Enzyme design. Sequence first.
Site, PDB file in Angstrom:
ATOM      1  N   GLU B  14     -33.639 -18.939 -13.533  1.00 43.04           N
ATOM      2  CA  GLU B  14     -33.070 -18.456 -14.812  1.00 43.04           C
ATOM      3  C   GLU B  14     -33.440 -16.635 -14.204  1.00 43.04           C
ATOM      4  O   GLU B  14     -32.636 -15.671 -13.832  1.00 43.04           O
ATOM      5  CB  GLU B  14     -32.021 -19.048 -16.112  1.00 43.04           C
ATOM      6  CG  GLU B  14     -31.092 -18.983 -15.497  1.00 43.04           C
ATOM      7  CD  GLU B  14     -29.629 -19.302 -14.745  1.00 43.04           C
ATOM      8  OE1 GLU B  14     -29.227 -18.419 -13.755  1.00 43.04           O
ATOM      9  OE2 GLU B  14     -28.422 -20.130 -14.284  1.00 43.04           O
ATOM     10  N   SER B 143     -26.640 -23.661 -13.996  1.00 48.45           N
ATOM     11  CA  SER B 143     -27.181 -24.215 -13.073  1.00 48.45           C
ATOM     12  C   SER B 143     -27.717 -25.557 -12.986  1.00 48.45           C
ATOM     13  O   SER B 143     -27.579 -26.421 -12.690  1.00 48.45           O
ATOM     14  CB  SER B 143     -28.935 -23.190 -13.166  1.00 48.45           C
ATOM     15  OG  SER B 143     -29.266 -23.600 -11.565  1.00 48.45           O
ATOM     16  N   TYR B 209     -31.233 -32.860   4.223  1.00 48.76           N
ATOM     17  CA  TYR B 209     -30.483 -32.858   5.133  1.00 48.76           C
ATOM     18  C   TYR B 209     -29.532 -32.823   3.805  1.00 48.76           C
ATOM     19  O   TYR B 209     -29.107 -33.489   2.263  1.00 48.76           O
ATOM     20  CB  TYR B 209     -29.831 -34.477   5.746  1.00 48.76           C
ATOM     21  CG  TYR B 209     -28.327 -34.424   5.785  1.00 48.76           C
ATOM     22  CD1 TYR B 209     -27.375 -34.133   6.802  1.00 48.76           C
ATOM     23  CD2 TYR B 209     -27.565 -34.959   4.433  1.00 48.76           C
ATOM     24  CE1 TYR B 209     -26.277 -34.255   6.849  1.00 48.76           C
ATOM     25  CE2 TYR B 209     -26.281 -35.141   4.724  1.00 48.76           C
ATOM     26  CZ  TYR B 209     -25.861 -34.249   5.771  1.00 48.76           C
ATOM     27  OH  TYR B 209     -24.590 -34.786   6.786  1.00 48.76           O
ATOM     28  N   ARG B 247     -15.769 -12.164 -11.214  1.00 54.27           N
ATOM     29  CA  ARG B 247     -15.753 -12.355  -9.994  1.00 54.27           C
ATOM     30  C   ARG B 247     -14.719 -13.599  -9.907  1.00 54.27           C
ATOM     31  O   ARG B 247     -15.411 -14.646 -10.837  1.00 54.27           O
ATOM     32  CB  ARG B 247     -16.933 -13.327  -9.103  1.00 54.27           C
ATOM     33  CG  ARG B 247     -17.298 -13.179  -7.209  1.00 54.27           C
ATOM     34  CD  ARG B 247     -18.277 -14.288  -7.121  1.00 54.27           C
ATOM     35  NE  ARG B 247     -18.918 -15.206  -7.776  1.00 54.27           N
ATOM     36  CZ  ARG B 247     -19.337 -16.493  -7.318  1.00 54.27           C
ATOM     37  NH1 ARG B 247     -20.733 -16.220  -7.997  1.00 54.27           N
ATOM     38  NH2 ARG B 247     -19.189 -17.405  -7.162  1.00 54.27           N
ATOM     39  N   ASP B 249     -13.354 -17.188  -9.078  1.00 58.61           N
ATOM     40  CA  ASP B 249     -13.167 -18.595  -7.311  1.00 58.61           C
ATOM     41  C   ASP B 249     -11.772 -18.711  -8.005  1.00 58.61           C
ATOM     42  O   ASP B 249     -11.790 -19.014  -8.983  1.00 58.61           O
ATOM     43  CB  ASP B 249     -14.681 -18.611  -7.783  1.00 58.61           C
ATOM     44  CG  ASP B 249     -16.040 -18.426  -7.383  1.00 58.61           C
ATOM     45  OD1 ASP B 249     -16.029 -17.350  -7.063  1.00 58.61           O
ATOM     46  OD2 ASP B 249     -17.166 -19.032  -8.447  1.00 58.61           O
ATOM     47  N   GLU B 261     -12.708 -20.582 -11.807  1.00 58.85           N
ATOM     48  CA  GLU B 261     -14.465 -19.893 -12.189  1.00 58.85           C
ATOM     49  C   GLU B 261     -13.520 -18.196 -12.195  1.00 58.85           C
ATOM     50  O   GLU B 261     -12.820 -17.535 -11.467  1.00 58.85           O
ATOM     51  CB  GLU B 261     -15.661 -19.934 -11.595  1.00 58.85           C
ATOM     52  CG  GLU B 261     -16.299 -21.513 -11.051  1.00 58.85           C
ATOM     53  CD  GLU B 261     -16.148 -21.550 -12.416  1.00 58.85           C
ATOM     54  OE1 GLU B 261     -15.858 -21.421 -13.821  1.00 58.85           O
ATOM     55  OE2 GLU B 261     -16.616 -23.286 -12.512  1.00 58.85           O
ATOM     56  N   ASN B 263     -16.034 -15.291 -13.556  1.00 54.70           N
ATOM     57  CA  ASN B 263     -17.192 -14.302 -13.699  1.00 54.70           C
ATOM     58  C   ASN B 263     -17.583 -13.258 -14.402  1.00 54.70           C
ATOM     59  O   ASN B 263     -17.642 -12.176 -13.534  1.00 54.70           O
ATOM     60  CB  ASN B 263     -18.311 -14.386 -12.411  1.00 54.70           C
ATOM     61  CG  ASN B 263     -18.594 -16.339 -11.680  1.00 54.70           C
ATOM     62  OD1 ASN B 263     -18.598 -17.129 -12.199  1.00 54.70           O
ATOM     63  ND2 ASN B 263     -17.475 -16.658 -10.723  1.00 54.70           N
ATOM     64  N   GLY B 267     -23.929 -12.993  -8.983  1.00 53.24           N
ATOM     65  CA  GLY B 267     -25.096 -12.604  -8.525  1.00 53.24           C
ATOM     66  C   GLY B 267     -24.841 -11.239  -8.212  1.00 53.24           C
ATOM     67  O   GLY B 267     -23.878 -11.294  -7.373  1.00 53.24           O
TER      68      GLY B 267
END
Lengths: 300, 304
Positions: B14, B143, B209, B247, B249, B261, B263, B267
Amino acid sequence: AMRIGVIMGGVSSEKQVSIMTGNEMIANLDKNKYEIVPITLNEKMDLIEKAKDIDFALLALHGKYGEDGTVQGTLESLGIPYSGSNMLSSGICMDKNISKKILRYEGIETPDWIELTKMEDLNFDELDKLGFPLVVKPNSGGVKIVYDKDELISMLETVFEWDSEVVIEKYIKGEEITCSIFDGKQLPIISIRHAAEFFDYNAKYDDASTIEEVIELPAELKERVNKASLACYKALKCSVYARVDMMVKDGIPYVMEVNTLPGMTQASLLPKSADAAGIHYSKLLDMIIETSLRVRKEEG
Amino acid sequence: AMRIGVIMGGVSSEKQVSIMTGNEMIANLDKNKYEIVPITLNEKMDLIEKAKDIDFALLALHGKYGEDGTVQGTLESLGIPYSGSNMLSSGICMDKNISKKILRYEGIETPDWIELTKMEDLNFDELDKLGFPLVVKPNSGGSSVGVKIVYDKDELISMLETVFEWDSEVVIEKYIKGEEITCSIFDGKQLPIISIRHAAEFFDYNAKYDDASTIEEVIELPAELKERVNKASLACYKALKCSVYARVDMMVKDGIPYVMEVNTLPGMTQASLLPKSADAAGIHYSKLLDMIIETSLRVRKEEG
């Protein structure tokens, strides 16, 4: 010997009330268990310096200063355990609107209401749905009861002076009680009465003066009261202790207030509630310390 | 010129995200307007000293450290205005269970959920009212342990042990198959909606991958859905008492957006979602920063 910081602070009245709380604690803490470190906060953030040597913060605070959550947040960040509810729970319990929303989602009884904003105006649409009469309370936390059409209006003006945020509730008239919770166990209930008082020397009259007795309630109501007061404690994420103020109407208790930081002086409700259960003041502080320690550990 | 503290902090990852965010803001802050001071917290409470002389605190924080609201309550109590939502609003938005209870009260679509605690044992009958499949998220976010889908009962039991070491509380939702979107709000106005789709990615050098690979694009939604998404997104922002920006989501299914979500501290690097969205609206990065400052100052004033 574990160093117990007794934390006092705030401004004006609250500071006074905090100091009087801190002195009662400072006098009744077992001096053999504890090393007592009185801490008086000039400014709130002076707390970091002072808290640098103590092992526990026993909060003597009262009012917004100890209920908004900053002090708890700060103490968490310094890694110092401390008494009572945490930051999020203190904050939520000090917000009437958010509190009631979380309460109604659980279907816990609380008066129907509406929230009003300093900048915003009231759509009479949602308002009159709860009808009359009404009580107007500041959202963060005096009383104005409103009987009529124009009645409501006059108040918001001066409540918006002081609080940017107001709650308007339908007024329930009933018998007032207060239910202290300690660590998820309900303490003896207290009934609150109002009686007019005259003071000759100051020549003062008061009808708002309070009389509080411990009376065993009908076991039926006592069950419905204990259910609800523990549900609040749980739903608002309170910990280590709390005081739930309630209003009983036609058999049904409604939640009026939830205090994460109730009076801690010996004449205060929770210390009386405890004492009735046989827990004397000095031991009350022991429980608050041991339960707070355990809770903080579970948190992180 | 106003002195602007760019506040960076946190631990491990973070703190890196934070330093990165904080360095982008420093490089892009308009130096005709601002005397720019970087602030890097080794410990959170170093803030009291390090912030003594600044006129405004621009938060470059990311994660719980800027979400839990200690930093906001701190700056409040010092009288230093700061960016973004206040302590209460951050705390609430960081708590999934409280957040869902408050949005639900307003009848804002969010999926059904159960909360579990590590003390209480998860009766599987209360959890069978959910059924399958299920998304398991730490209640306080983060995270470290991520969001994970579990199809059956066993895949669930594992996922619960994985989360519970990291979080006291866990929120378990009905999974909803749908189209992902993100909605940035700025000062009560909806910015352009971002559509997110997934595509597998192969990386040759590290021989890696990733089918978790995300693609994020600003594409005009059909007018009806866009009006319905914009109503819901703003109602979330207002319901959780957010301010200056947030934000939200969302997962759209059969024309119905569901809140995933909220926020208060998304970011802020130029490659992040809220900046891209503001950029699609022609508010470029340096102006976004001015806006956050100006608006945050206005809001902090309104807050007494």
